[PDB]
Amino acid sequence: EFKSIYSLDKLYPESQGSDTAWRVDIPLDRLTISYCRSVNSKAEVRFHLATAEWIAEPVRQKIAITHKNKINRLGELILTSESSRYQFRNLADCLQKIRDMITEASQKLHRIRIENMNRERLRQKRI
Amino acid sequence: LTYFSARKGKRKTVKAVIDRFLRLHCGLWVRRKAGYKKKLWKKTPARKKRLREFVFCNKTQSKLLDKMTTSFWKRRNWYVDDPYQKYHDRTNLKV
Amino acid sequence: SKNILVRMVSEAGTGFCFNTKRNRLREKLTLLHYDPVVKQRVLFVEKKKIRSL
Amino acid sequence: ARALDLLRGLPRVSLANLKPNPGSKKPERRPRGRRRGRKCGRGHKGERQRGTRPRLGFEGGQTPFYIRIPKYGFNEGHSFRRQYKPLSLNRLQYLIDLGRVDPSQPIDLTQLVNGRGVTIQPLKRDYGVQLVEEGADTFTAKVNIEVQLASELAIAAIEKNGGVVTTAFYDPRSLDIVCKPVPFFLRGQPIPKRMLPPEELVPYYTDAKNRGYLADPAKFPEARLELARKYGYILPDITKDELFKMLCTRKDPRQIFFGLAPGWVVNMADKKILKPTDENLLKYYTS
Amino acid sequence: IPDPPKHEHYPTPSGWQPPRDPPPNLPYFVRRSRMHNIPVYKDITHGNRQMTVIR
RNA sequence: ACCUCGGAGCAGAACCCAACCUCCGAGCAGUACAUGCUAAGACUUCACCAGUCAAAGCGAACCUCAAUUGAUCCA
RNA sequence: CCGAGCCUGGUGAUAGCUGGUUGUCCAAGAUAGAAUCUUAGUUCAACUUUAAAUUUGCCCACAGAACCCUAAAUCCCCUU
Ligand SMILES: [Mg+2]
Ligand SMILES: [Mg+2]
Ligand SMILES: [Mg+2]
Ligand SMILES: [Mg+2]
Ligand SMILES: [Mg+2]
Ligand SMILES: [Mg+2]
Ligand SMILES: [Mg+2]
Ligand SMILES: [Mg+2]
Ligand SMILES: [Mg+2]
Ligand SMILES: [Mg+2]
Helix, strand or coil: CCCCCCHHHCCCCCCCCCCHCCCCCCCCCCCCCEEEEECCCEEEEEEEECCCCCCCCCHHHHHHHCCCCCCCCCCCCEEEEECCCCCHHHHHHHHHHHHHHHHHHHHHHHHHHHHHHHHHHHCCCCC | CCCCCCCCCCCCCHHHHHHEEEECCCCCCEEEECCCCEEEEEECHHHHHHCCCEECCHHHHHHHHHHHHHHHCCCCCCCCCCCHHHHCCCCCCCC | CCEEEEEEEEECCCCCCEEEEEEECCCCCEEEEEEHHHHHEEEEEEEEEEEEE | CCCHHHHHHCCCCCCCCCCCCCCCCCCCCCCCCCCCCCCCCCCCHHHHHCCCCCCCCCCCCCHHHHCCCCCCCCCCCCCCCCCCCCEEEEHHHHHHHCCCCCCCCCCCCCHHHCCCCCCCCCCCCCCCCECCCCCCCCCCCCEEEECHHHHHHHHHHHHHHCEEEEEEECHHHHHHHHHCHHHHHCCCCCCCCCCCCCCCCCHHHCCCCCCCCCCCCCCHHHHHHHHHHHHHHCCCCCCCCCCCCHHHHHHHCCCCCCCCCCCEEEECCEEEEECCHHHHHHHHHHH | CCCCCCCCCCCCCCCCCCCCCHHHHCCCCCCCCCCCCCEEEEECCCCCCEEEECC
16 A cells, blocks of 8 residues: 555565564473462463473472472472562563573572581491 | 842742752652761761761742742653652642 | 872773872872772782872 | 422522532631731731842842752753653453443554543653553453553563453644544544654564564464463464454554545545545645 | 444453443433443542542 | 861760850872772761762782862853 | 933833822731842742642650760650
8 A cells, every 4th residue: 555665665675575574392281380479470380390291301490409498299380479579570570580490400508517517527336 | 039030030949059959849849968978087887877878858848949830840751861750740648 | 299190990991990199299109009999909009199198 | 309399489599599619618818907917918018018139049149959969960851751641451451341442442552542541641752552461360351452561561461361362652732632532633634654763663573572563473372372381371373263263353553443544535524534636635645 | 432342252352341231211321421331430549548449 | 357177175975066266287299000890788077068888799819098078150 | 401412213111119009808828048239129948728639636654865074955756
């Protein structure tokens, strides 16, 4: 109907079809997600670790031993985030933390090791 | 202060307070503390940081300049790349 | 005219500077200082005078 | 009602039976008598009653408060600073539920301001309207919203439901006609062609992440994929629905309306639309 | 103002809900506004009068 | 003769208190160069201008004296 | 009626200074000080007034508030 000299077809002739503008890991259907509020909306993600086939074997148990705190009794890893009021942004940094966890898996503590050394030098005892 | 002009008969704002102060829509006014660009060598670190920090204004001197300014400067302005957007509104204010 | 105020400049070319007092008779001084940009103690040399005190 | 059955029995209303609401018009109090007349509320003796008081903000020779404070770059170039009015997708969901703006057609600033969604004051230097992340929940618009500025969450929420977002810059006199074209149609001149963005906002309107109308269409699938990868939501390919053509309806630069174009003069009384049909005039309006 | 569409699902998003029809027989009734909203409003006065009104 | 600032008595005991009332002083000096950045909470020379104290955190090591001085524009 | 004439006009010049400011009736109500080419004035403070939001306000009981160099008191303070 009307095409200017700065039109899309004139600026970039590589793309002509309007359908080209709308062409096409972490399976959401496998994951379990819930939401609540406490004034910020919290997003709680849960999923079974050992059942995730999209994660490889060495990465899976690595997350298990390094993040022993968050695993549930039933075997599901639980994760929460309530920084923002937007559940989408809550779901955003949730999977970002999961992405940061698998990447590093594929790759006061000063006081703690002191007492462990104190405990080790205390137990010189034979049967 | 110049209540009615001669060419249109309207209030006239002096550009002094424009350069010195800034408005938040709640009715608050801030300012840079004076003496922050003179004789910094003799001042202790606690003093110069107190001068660098902004400071609000009393209700009286705020009301005084509010009488001076006109309604154009009191409107709501939605600036971009403006850190004062969080502060134009007020939250959790009782009495 | 006992003391003199002098500025010093970062030798790394960052442009960080400050001032301190100095005696009119004492020779040039070179001292360390914590540059906020380089973020560690680094030597500054003072160049000229600003005012007497 | 209990109000009207009193008036039929009560007498007829006239100027003599007329009276305002008590408490509205308080009586004027003039300085004549014993109470006010003596001094009329001006003080005993001094500039207060003599009328030679100093100006406002004078400290009797002492430096006023407004000069002792130093100058700082608070509001410099405020008549050229970047301004845009907010718009929340909560309101967009609200307005479509009211039915003033139809989601069946492409939404636009014209359809918006014709709906009185938000006022706009182009002579107060606001070059459009921005989307606001407040309202991410309860949003099923599916509209092809036209906007100037856009947030990341707003684009993700709109694209998740199948809508379309796109930025389109307008000049000052190109925008006031956009938000209100009919008075220019009472003038009869040809509608003016749009311009490119200014010498600083071009990186914004050329980027693909913010849906720039100068950006390529080939890069929008990539930006859509990253947002779906970012905020964890399925990416509905909108090519399937029957109204996919409607969703992709967009205006090229130097054109205001999808139908009209620069140079096209429009008339309402004895409705007619006219062209120049001159080579020199036509080839410039395209430019 | 156009009469809004008859949504198949209620309550409509954005907390909107049109009035029930027929109305309830009562000694009174509260009508909606031009935008078919509830005529309940807020107001501040004297800096401290923190009230709400119905019209 | 004085015009600013600090200390003592008048003002004995939370605070403040003047007199062309009685005394002693100041307009510096010395040592570091983290005399770096930020931050809770409070006082305040009876207003304001100013002047003050500072937890904690980042980053590091392992200030004394009492006044000891000066706003805005402008350069 | 010349330390510089008289007339008009600018001019209703300006004057922190004096002079005076019109009907009736009622309530509340004199209040530390700082700065100023400032002390015959003005801005702020404090006091006073109006219309309101909220809850503590006042009197205050044991305890508590310096060595230096023996006063009437004072500050704070739950109860009442
Ligand atoms: Mg007087
Ligand atoms: Mg008189
Ligand atoms: Mg005068
Ligand atoms: Mg109102
Ligand atoms: Mg005080
Ligand atoms: Mg600390
Ligand atoms: Mg004569
Ligand atoms: Mg006069
Ligand atoms: Mg009385
Ligand atoms: Mg009590």
